[PDB]
């Protein structure tokens, strides 16, 4: 990825390609300059340093992964690659925001990210239940 144009992050780009839809990079850019716009006029913080904050809380370190084997269905345990952390935390916080009561996406976006950084919310929520479901007989 090419780093982001304001902030020069790569990480910033791909978070940008997720809430982009209709190949609107246009719409997309401005919806996750503003969200950082609002981070730092509600909590006087680096928007950028907060964003990184939300997507490492996010991580999952491990999961049970859905995989097909031989035409089954299969559930298996195991460690999440550095690059399936990262998409993970970005669907999560997308998904996690797509889902609050604000009607301006930006500020849905700014809403969930400052949640994630301190480590609260359903992006961070998703992640704990992950690896607490990676971490019997009749399964529970």
Same mark, same amino acid.
């Given at each position: 990825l090419q780093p982001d144009?304001?902030? &020069? *992050?790569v990480l910033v780009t791909a978070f940008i390609n997720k809430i982009m839809? *209709? &190949?609107?990079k246009n719409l997309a850019a401005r919806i996750f300059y503003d969200a950082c716009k609002i981070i730092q006029e509600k909590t006087g913080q680096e928007p950028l340093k907060v964003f990184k904050q939300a997507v490492e809380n996010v991580k999952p370190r491990m999961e049970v992964r859905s995989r097909r084997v031989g035409g089954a269905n299969y559930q298996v345990p195991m460690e999440v690659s550095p690059r399936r952390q990262q998409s993970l935390a970005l669907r999560w916080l997308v998904q996690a925001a797509n889902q609050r009561?604000?009607?301006r996406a930006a500020v849905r976006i700014a809403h969930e990210l400052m949640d994630a950084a301190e480590g609260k919310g359903g992006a961070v929520k998703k992640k704990e239940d992950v690896e607490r479901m990676a971490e019997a007989h009749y399964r529970w």
């Open positions: 144009l304001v902030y &020069g *992050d839809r *209709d &190949g609107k009561p604000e009607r």
